[PDB]
DNA sequence: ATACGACAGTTACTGTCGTAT
DNA sequence: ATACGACAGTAACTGTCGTAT
């Protein structure tokens, strides 16, 4: 028996899918006409592609099977359109990984409708998807190398240390052992991970990570660590000292201020004089100084001093560099 | 990667509903046309029910059945991707877009068999807590289901929409337009033509009320792609389109390389180490806000309207904060 | 038993180029 | 326009063989 490397994967997945009790490596090798070792490699491959694949030990041996795992109810165009423009927005940004997964969810999701449903909602969704676009922010393009990303998620799922060369941060070029905490998709993307004894989480730019390896050591994360909370410690990406920020939006821009997102923790309070008071705690003053720049003259930096300072040092730096003086 | 591209192709042809050209299979897998032929010849062996449909003067190929149910089950990774993309909008402020993906997620889990759903449910939950998307600060989008509902309905009926627009030059006038689409962004906008040969202009959804879908045909142009219109600006605002050209000093040069300024982009390393960035777009304020991010490391060489725009807003805030 | 590498040695995929019905 | 070889040159696949659970 046989058929070429590319199609043997479907052929083996189909086999483990239609087996009740599972097949052993020597059963696969005989059904694939390939022989023990590369059937192992093929079993490898389809487990990668079908994480639903389970193995059952009836010792001494071991049998592998893909259980059913599916039973459809034909969602709406706007649901589908939502999914597509979602994925469209992501590949438009350069987030090829997040986009890929969503395009794959779409393909399998479409295929699972009937002859009728598929061609019937088709022009519906593309009508919608053309009548919707997400504006793309200017900024850095995220590194989404599903090799490095797959390695992170692998280590995280396993409770295992991740290892990589990092070209950044005070001593480039060299191999680093971390406890991976999570992935922070932002301007670029970041590994959130503890390095070394008694560390506290640091941000590792995916742009700068080569040569990942999922080590065989346990690296559990602190039981008290929350990726969200870690992200919410800063106004943007940078984790400075966490400041108490106090801003006063002029009345001219109060309507905006009252329907605006400054931080996850914001309290906005309207004032009798029509101005609006904004308080929140966060690091990332520079990143904050930038956004305040888009408020023009309608914002007063009440607190903290260090914000006031960086706002002005930033201002005068561009001001001479473009001739505002 | 490359062991599953045959299977990635077979999924694409089972969902395409009318097929791909032999050459757009090559573009959605980055393969080169000849390679794709062999992929097609091998998908056909795995999926003999694949139809070949003439669409002159090329062919389409589609799997009309759907795959085996084992190539259809979505993974925890894809499920988690939907959620991270849902929770990203929920957090943004964009609760109408978000609840269609949660609706989709819901109908995906429900379609799993019981014992399968309970086994993947924790794998995704763990997946969604190891990943989060930074929410940038900015306006909380206005997504009134009834305002969006009205707009889409009109676009589906190719009908005129009339609303009262509290903004612009005579606020309160109820206006009748041809709705072309929606630009989701800082706040959200209706892009729409108004009357005889009008040029497309943007309408804030939060400045709309009294939305009626009238039964007057409102056909759009079909040269018009909403995407083209969106990309006419650097951000949201559509003033006169400028040929913007900047040099990123060689200090911040590696960032300039892996940076997105515009869709009409071109960045090339100059000789002295600088990087030259060129793109074509209106919206000079939003652009000058972004150039503030670079501080001293960017010089504006054209246009002067962007320099005057930068110095205006640079001087506006410098006085406001005590800089000079 | 399976998990899994290191590693000669065959071959398969890639793409370019024609010749077809 | 494809459906297809053919054919060098590139790249992985394969199977044998270790060593570890």
Automatic annotation (TrEMBL), chain B:
Domain WYL: 147-213
Cleaved signal peptide residues: none
Coiled-coil stretches: none
The WCX domain, residue ranges: 242-317
Highest taxon, organism lineage: Bacteria
Stored PANTHER family: PROTEIN PAFC, PTHR34580
Protein's name according to its UniProt entry: DeoR-family transcriptional regulator
């Amino acid at each position: 028996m046989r058929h070429e490397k590319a199609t043997r994967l479907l052929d083996l997945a189909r086999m483990l899918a239609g087996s009740a009790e599972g097949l052993t490596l020597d059963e696969m090798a005989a059904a694939l006409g390939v022989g023990r070792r590369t059937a192992e490699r093929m079993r490898d491959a389809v487990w990668a592609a079908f994480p639903q694949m389970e193995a059952i030990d009836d010792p001494p041996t071991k049998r592998f099977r893909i259980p059913s795992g599916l039973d459809f109810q034909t969602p709406t165009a706007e649901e589908l359109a939502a999914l597509r423009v979602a994925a469209d927005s992501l590949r438009a940004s350069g987030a090829d990984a997040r986009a890929s997964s969503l395009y794959a969810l779409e393909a399998k999701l479409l295929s699972a409708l009937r002859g009728s449903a598929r061609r019937r909602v088709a022009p519906d969704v593309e009508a919608l998807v053309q009548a919707e676009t997400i504006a793309v922010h200017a900024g850095p393009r995220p590194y989404e190398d599903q090799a490095v990303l797959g390695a992170i998620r692998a280590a995280i799922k396993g409770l295992q240390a991740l290892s990589f060369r990092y070209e950044g941060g005070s001593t480039p070029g060299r191999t680093r052992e971390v406890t991976p905490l999570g992935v922070l998709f932002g301007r670029s993307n970041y590994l959130v991970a503890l390095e070394g004894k008694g560390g506290k989480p640091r941000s590792w730019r995916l742009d700068r990570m080569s040569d990942l390896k999922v080590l065989d050591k346990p690296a559990p994360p602190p039981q008290d660590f929350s990726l969200q909370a870690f992200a919410d410690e800063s106004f943007g990406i940078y984790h400075d000292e966490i400041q108490d920020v106090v801003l006063r939006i002029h009345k001219s821009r109060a309507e905006d201020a009252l329907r605006w997102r400054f931080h996850a923790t914001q309290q906005v309070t309207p004032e009798a004089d029509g101005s609006v008071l904004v308080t929140f705690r966060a690091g990332g003053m520079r990143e904050l100084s930038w956004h305040l720049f888009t408020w023009g003259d309608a914002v007063e930096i009440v607190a903290p001093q260090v914000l006031k300072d960086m706002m002005v040092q930033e201002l005068r730096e561009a001001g001479r560099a473009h001739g505002a003086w």
